[PDB]
Amino acid sequence: TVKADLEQKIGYEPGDHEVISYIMYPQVFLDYQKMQREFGAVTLLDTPTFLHGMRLNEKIEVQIEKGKTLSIRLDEIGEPDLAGNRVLFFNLNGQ
């Protein structure tokens, strides 16, 4: 019953570890799943990058899996507009 409910809540069929962690920490697991869907596996970032983001002109390399390494460089931080949004000028994988 819990596993079917969780497969409804998260977008896939959970493992036994996911089911058991959803039992103990239901809202914490669901918030973790939402953050996984939004920001992805932030566990792969290095800790200074994890806690502080990026500086201007910094180059970081994030190995997301074996053989794949994201080359990320922050070129410019835009001024905030009237809607409160900033445009950040990244150079992801050369582009």
């Binding site: 053989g67 794949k68 050369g94």
Partner: peptide, 22 residues
């Protein structure tokens, strides 16, 4: 597909067109 690249070729398109790059 596996790509190889030098450090000076890190922004080459062929590096990012493969399943693995080294």
């Amino acid at each position: 597909t596996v790509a190889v690249y030098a450090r000076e070729d890190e922004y080459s398109v062929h590096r990012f067109k493969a399943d693995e790059s080294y």
